[PDB]
């Protein structure tokens, strides 16, 4: 099925997922010229101090640290959002080289990596019922841009090679997520899709203005991650980024002047 190849990346994708070619679909080049202040868009309510982490998996596309989402133990809300919305699990996109890797822009600018972490409407009871809805999802984006380490990112990086092919997964409770933030909660925001199949238009996207640094070493170590499954032949896990989408009708806001 579906990867980041040149068989079956995102050139590919729209032939089992039409929704490719969509009208709301990300992820999208942030013109910041033309995003427009809107001064009625709310503060974000980022609240993670009751978040229990349980289990990071290699997926075979990227690694995903899971939450228990059974309860409202870390949520999402305020911002442009009129709900309560559940951390689920966090994922990072990367490149193979420092200058390429997120999938959002900022005026055609690349960071070396993205972080999205997946919150889901409680209103909709389940992550499969919110994936179905036009307000399922609530994505915060944060770009990764090589520098000084993040000390709170380290645990994650200290983990991936117990998690090195599709489909290990390991023990990793006691995670908090707070230490992945930037100072600033300042961000852009619009309406958009999964950047994976089944690449679902259910998502509020909030992309943070300010990047967070990390290691040459920390992204390093996410690039000696493996797509393949264990005795299967070696294809690093890197360039698994779907690049910007036409912006079609839309409008992006931005929180801050
Ligand atoms: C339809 C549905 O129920 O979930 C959508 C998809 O995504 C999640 S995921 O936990 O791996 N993860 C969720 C959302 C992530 O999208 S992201 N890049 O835009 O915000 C990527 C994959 C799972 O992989 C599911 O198997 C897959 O179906
Ligand atoms: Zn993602």
């Not at 997926?59 to 133990?73: I, L, M, R, T």
Request: a neutral charge; one cysteine or more.
């Amino acid at each position: 099925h579906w990867g980041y190849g040149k068989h079956n990346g995102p050139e590919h994708w729209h032939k089992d997922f039409p929704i490719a070619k969509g009208e709301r679909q990300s992820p999208v080049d942030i013109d910041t010229h033309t995003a427009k202040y809107d001064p009625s868009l709310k503060p974000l309510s980022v609240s993670y101090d009751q978040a229990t982490s349980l289990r990071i998996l290699n997926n075979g596309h990227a690694f995903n640290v899971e939450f228990d989402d059974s309860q409202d133990k870390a949520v999402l809300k305020g911002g442009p959002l009129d709900g309560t919305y559940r951390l689920i699990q966090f994922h990072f996109h990367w490149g193979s080289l420092d200058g390429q890797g997120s999938e959002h822009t900022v005026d055609k600018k690349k960071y070396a990596a993205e972080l999205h972490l997946v919150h889901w409407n409680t209103k909709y009871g389940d992550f499969g019922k919110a994936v179905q809805q036009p307000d399922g999802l609530a994505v915060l984006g944060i770009f990764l841009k090589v520098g000084s380490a993040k000390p709170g990112l380290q645990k994650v990086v200290d983990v991936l090679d117990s998690i090195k092919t599709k489909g290990k997964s390991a023990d990793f409770t006691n995670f908090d997520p707070r230490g992945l933030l930037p100072e600033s909660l300042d961000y852009w925001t619009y309406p958009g899709s999964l950047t994976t199949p089944p690449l679902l238009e259910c998502v509020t996207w909030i992309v943070l203005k300010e990047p967070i640094s990390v290691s040459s070493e920390q992204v390093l170590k996410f690039r000696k991650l493996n797509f393949n499954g264990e005795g299967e032949p070696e294809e690093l896990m890197v360039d698994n980024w779907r690049p910007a989408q036409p912006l079609k009708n839309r409008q992006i806001k931005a929180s801050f002047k």
